[PDB]
Design a protein around this motif. Structure first.
Motif, mmCIF file in Angstrom:
data_model
loop_
_atom_site.group_PDB
_atom_site.id
_atom_site.type_symbol
_atom_site.label_atom_id
_atom_site.label_comp_id
_atom_site.label_asym_id
_atom_site.label_seq_id
_atom_site.Cartn_x
_atom_site.Cartn_y
_atom_site.Cartn_z
ATOM 1 N N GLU A 146 -0.398 7.861 18.833
ATOM 2 C CA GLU A 146 -0.176 7.487 17.445
ATOM 3 C C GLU A 146 -1.470 7.663 16.668
ATOM 4 O OE1 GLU A 146 2.981 7.794 16.924
ATOM 5 O OE2 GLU A 146 3.543 5.929 17.936
ATOM 6 N N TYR A 147 -1.356 8.237 15.476
ATOM 7 C CA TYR A 147 -2.491 8.477 14.597
ATOM 8 C C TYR A 147 -2.520 7.416 13.507
ATOM 9 C CZ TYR A 147 -5.436 10.703 11.029
ATOM 10 O OH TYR A 147 -6.400 10.969 10.084
ATOM 11 N N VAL A 148 -3.726 6.973 13.166
ATOM 12 C CA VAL A 148 -3.951 5.954 12.149
ATOM 13 C C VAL A 148 -4.786 6.616 11.065
ATOM 14 C CG1 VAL A 148 -4.659 3.589 11.703
ATOM 15 C CG2 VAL A 148 -3.987 4.266 14.013
ATOM 16 N N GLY A 149 -4.152 6.910 9.934
ATOM 17 C CA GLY A 149 -4.759 7.667 8.867
ATOM 18 C C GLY A 149 -5.200 6.802 7.706
ATOM 19 N N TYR A 150 -5.441 7.459 6.576
ATOM 20 C CA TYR A 150 -5.928 6.783 5.387
ATOM 21 C C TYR A 150 -4.804 5.968 4.742
ATOM 22 C CZ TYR A 150 -9.978 9.775 6.054
ATOM 23 O OH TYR A 150 -11.085 10.403 6.576
ATOM 24 N N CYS A 151 -5.131 5.315 3.628
ATOM 25 C CA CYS A 151 -4.171 4.454 2.951
ATOM 26 C C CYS A 151 -3.090 5.278 2.264
ATOM 27 C CB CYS A 151 -4.880 3.573 1.922
ATOM 28 S SG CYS A 151 -5.669 2.094 2.606
ATOM 29 N N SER A 152 -1.832 4.922 2.520
ATOM 30 C CA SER A 152 -0.691 5.491 1.824
ATOM 31 C C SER A 152 -0.277 4.557 0.689
ATOM 32 C CB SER A 152 0.466 5.725 2.798
ATOM 33 O OG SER A 152 0.923 4.500 3.344
ATOM 34 N N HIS A 153 0.780 4.941 -0.031
ATOM 35 C CA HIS A 153 1.267 4.092 -1.113
ATOM 36 C C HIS A 153 1.863 2.792 -0.594
ATOM 37 C CE1 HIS A 153 2.709 3.191 -5.163
ATOM 38 N NE2 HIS A 153 3.844 2.810 -4.606
ATOM 39 N N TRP A 154 2.420 2.800 0.615
ATOM 40 C CA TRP A 154 2.978 1.568 1.155
ATOM 41 C C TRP A 154 1.870 0.582 1.490
ATOM 42 C CZ3 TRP A 154 6.964 -1.544 1.860
ATOM 43 C CH2 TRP A 154 6.909 -2.494 2.886
ATOM 44 N N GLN A 155 0.725 1.087 1.953
ATOM 45 C CA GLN A 155 -0.375 0.203 2.313
ATOM 46 C C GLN A 155 -1.073 -0.358 1.079
ATOM 47 O OE1 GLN A 155 -1.678 3.452 5.505
ATOM 48 N NE2 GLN A 155 -2.745 1.519 5.912
ATOM 49 N N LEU A 156 -1.169 0.429 0.002
ATOM 50 C CA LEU A 156 -1.856 -0.043 -1.198
ATOM 51 C C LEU A 156 -1.033 -1.088 -1.944
ATOM 52 C CD1 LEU A 156 -3.168 3.412 -2.460
ATOM 53 C CD2 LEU A 156 -4.575 1.600 -1.468
ATOM 54 N N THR A 157 0.291 -0.920 -1.988
ATOM 55 C CA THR A 157 1.127 -1.895 -2.683
ATOM 56 C C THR A 157 1.105 -3.241 -1.972
ATOM 57 O OG1 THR A 157 3.098 -1.112 -1.501
ATOM 58 C CG2 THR A 157 2.631 -0.127 -3.671
ATOM 59 N N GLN A 158 1.069 -3.229 -0.639
ATOM 60 C CA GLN A 158 1.077 -4.478 0.112
ATOM 61 C C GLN A 158 -0.296 -5.140 0.109
ATOM 62 O OE1 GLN A 158 3.751 -5.971 1.318
ATOM 63 N NE2 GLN A 158 5.129 -4.307 0.705
ATOM 64 N N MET A 159 -1.362 -4.359 0.316
ATOM 65 C CA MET A 159 -2.706 -4.929 0.297
ATOM 66 C C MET A 159 -3.044 -5.508 -1.069
ATOM 67 S SD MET A 159 -4.946 -2.225 2.584
ATOM 68 C CE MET A 159 -6.476 -3.133 2.380
ATOM 69 N N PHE A 160 -2.533 -4.900 -2.142
ATOM 70 C CA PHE A 160 -2.767 -5.441 -3.475
ATOM 71 C C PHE A 160 -2.109 -6.804 -3.647
ATOM 72 C CE2 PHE A 160 -4.207 -4.788 -7.744
ATOM 73 C CZ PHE A 160 -3.343 -5.523 -8.526
ATOM 74 N N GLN A 161 -0.979 -7.034 -2.975
ATOM 75 C CA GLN A 161 -0.312 -8.328 -3.048
ATOM 76 C C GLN A 161 -0.983 -9.372 -2.164
ATOM 77 O OE1 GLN A 161 3.726 -7.442 -1.999
ATOM 78 N NE2 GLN A 161 4.119 -6.251 -3.861
#
Ligand SMILES: Nc1ncnc2c1ncn2[C@@H]1O[C@H](COP(=O)(O)OP(=O)(O)O)[C@@H](O)[C@H]1O
Ligand SMILES: Nc1ncnc2c1ncn2[C@@H]1O[C@H](COP(=O)(O)OP(=O)(O)O)[C@@H](O)[C@H]1O
Ligand SMILES: [Mg+2]
Ligand SMILES: [Mg+2]
Lengths: 371, 61, 223, 33
Positions: A304-319
């Motif tokens: 499994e690869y762990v890449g940069y921030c996607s839109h799903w990660q930014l919306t949740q981290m912002f909350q």
């Protein structure tokens, strides 16, 4: 004569009554705390109580005192699903020499009803209470030479919701590791080494070491941190330490790219003469130094690869960093963030919110400073 | 051994005492199981032969 | 009989009341706790790193009151609010994946009260101090990483004369180390801010920059 | 005979009072001081 005849009959009647009654007695078996705590919560209206004082004098000049109330020596009456129950805590002339030189204590529960389905619930309720009271902590182990010892106090469990990866990326790994713990018979019966391999690879600061720290706390497992940059670490030092690891633990490797040699790593990863119930995790910030044959099934059971921030990660981290905000603010932010940066790691997103802690709307107007 | 057999053989008993197992392995993992045995006093059990009087009694020693 | 301590009769005290309300005894116990705690006075225990281990350094010092160090108005209250916010909010950090650590930097001319104030701040919060001077000879890069990794709970870390900084490259994991304990507050004191790197004092390593100047008109009236 | 009869009534009255009487007992839990 008359008195003796009357007394004998009375005793027999009590024994018959005992058959249609119920008695429970625990004596200093570390059940007192659980049972007693439930009693005070359940009664809510009690007269005779004893005081136990907690003296949590942490070595900092800090003195913490709280009072835990329990019923005193004697009897009490409570109302339950069944008929009124007589609860008694009584002292005796015998003495305990084990701990503190105190009177032996017996607690007796007597009920009118003849069904024993009740107490099974009561005991379980106390277990629920005792485990609700206590909070689980992840115990960390550090290799001091050839042995393991506890390191500081038990750390508070970082929740798994903090490390925010793509959807379905965290759930697929959880399914694989939960299957390994719950199936110990499938391996030994088939002669397979009871071990599971996992690999997370990607650029630095993506969350390879972040996610593994939180996963063990959720599964109530310990962690064995191991960086591959130590000076007092050798080949023979590592083979022993991995064989005397505590049960219900996860082995972590940091920056595997710097492999220590590659040929000598084969028997270290998959050794036939090794303990059972061993889970290994591998993290490398540069996949361009490992052989593709190192990550096959048997050594690594899920790539499994762990890449940069996607839109799903930014919306949740912002909350997470800014709760209570409007959903639209967690869309204008993620829209313009990706429009000003081509690639951005969560470690840079975790540090950017440190400039505007608890200050919404400032993150949208100041994205150009990230160039 | 004797106490475990008594509870297993009767399966239908009234006066019982609770012994708690606190297998707190050093990992934050707490394992609790309950082993039940007869309480302080006397019991009657049914076997191939006639009713047997079983008594467990405490002392001042 | 008690065999634990001294061979004395076991002692029980009974309080019996006629009334049917239990509000009375709740007050009685509370008053008794207040009396015993008023008599004793807290002392700040100082610890000094002897090589790779920690040992007590002298007796517990008498707490220098926070009003003794006389700085400008609002300077003592802003630092109290910032550090009380950190101790009273341990959930805001871990839930958001931030390491539960706070950085502080104090700079100014020599002898202005940077090290004086930190002695009195720990006494107010009922915290201990871990003395560590950056002039030791037996200190190396790995020696400092270990000492900084086991901090006592409810304690403050003190650094003396950071301007004379042991190497700089090995100081990165020492300042902001991912593998470090929780509830750790670090203080930094430098008599010359014109020797530190501007990237060294960002949030994550330093969460509050503060200057300590000369006596103002308000300080002379109070002294 | 006489002694047994008198004791039973008296003892029961005290138990009724126990509900209407509050009691607090600490035992050498370092609260004595
Ligand atoms: N995917 C992620 N979600 C939330 N936080 C992250 C993520 N990845 C990294 N972080 C944050 O970055 C910091 C360090 O990450 P780290 O584990 O060192 O990255 P890596 O191990 O991949 O080099 C941690 O404080 C962590 O909270
Ligand atoms: N702001 C202040 N208020 C009261 N006393 C001070 C103050 N600043 C310094 N002192 C006094 O100066 C002496 C040493 O100060 P010190 O902590 O060595 O200064 P620095 O640490 O800034 O070099 C102490 O005896 C202390 O009482
Ligand atoms: Mg890494
Ligand atoms: Mg100084």
């Amino acid at each position: 004569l008359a008195m003796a005849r009357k007394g004998a009959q009375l005793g027999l009647v009590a024994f018959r009554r005992h058959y249609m009654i119920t008695l429970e007695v625990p004596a200093r078996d570390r059940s007192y705390a659980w049972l007693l705590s439930w009693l005070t919560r359940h009664s809510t209206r009690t007269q005779h109580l004893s005081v136990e004082t907690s003296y949590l004098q942490h070595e900092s000049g800090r003195i913490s005192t709280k009072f835990e109330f329990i019923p005193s020596p004697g009897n009490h009456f409570i109302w339950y699903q069944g008929k009124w129950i007589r609860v008694e805590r009584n002292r005796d002339m015998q003495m305990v020499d084990l701990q503190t030189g105190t009177p032996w204590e017996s607690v007796t529960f007597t009920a009118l009803g003849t069904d024993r389905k009740v107490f099974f619930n009561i005991l379980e309720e106390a277990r629920a209470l005792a485990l609700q009271q206590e909070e689980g902590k992840t115990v960390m182990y550090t290799a001091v030479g050839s042995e393991w010892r506890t390191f500081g106090y038990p750390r508070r469990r970082r929740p798994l919701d903090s490390v925010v990866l793509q959807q379905g990326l965290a759930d697929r790994i959880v399914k694989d590791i939960r299957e390994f713990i719950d199936n110990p018979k499938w391996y030994i019966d088939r002669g397979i080494p009871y071990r599971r391999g996992y690999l997370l690879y990607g650029p630095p600061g993506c969350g390879k070491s972040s996610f593994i720290t939180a996963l063990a706390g959720e599964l109530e497992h310990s962690i064995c941190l191991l960086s591959l940059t130590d000076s007092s670490l050798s080949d023979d030092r590592l083979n022993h330490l991995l064989s005397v690891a505590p049960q219900q633990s996860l082995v972590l490797l940091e920056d595997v790219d710097a492999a220590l040699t590659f040929s000598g790593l084969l028997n270290a990863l998959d050794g036939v003469a090794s303990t059972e119930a061993r889970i290994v995790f591998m993290t490398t910030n540069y996949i361009d130094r490992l052989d593709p044959a190192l990550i096959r099934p048997g050594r690594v059971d899920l790539k499994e690869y762990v890449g940069y921030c996607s839109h799903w990660q930014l919306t949740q981290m912002f909350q997470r960093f800014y709760p209570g905000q409007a959903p639209s603010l967690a869309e204008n932010f993620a829209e313009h963030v990706l429009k000003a940066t081509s690639e951005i790691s969560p470690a840079q997103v975790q540090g950017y919110f440190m400039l505007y802690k608890n200050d919404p709307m400032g993150a949208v107007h100041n994205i150009e400073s990230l160039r």
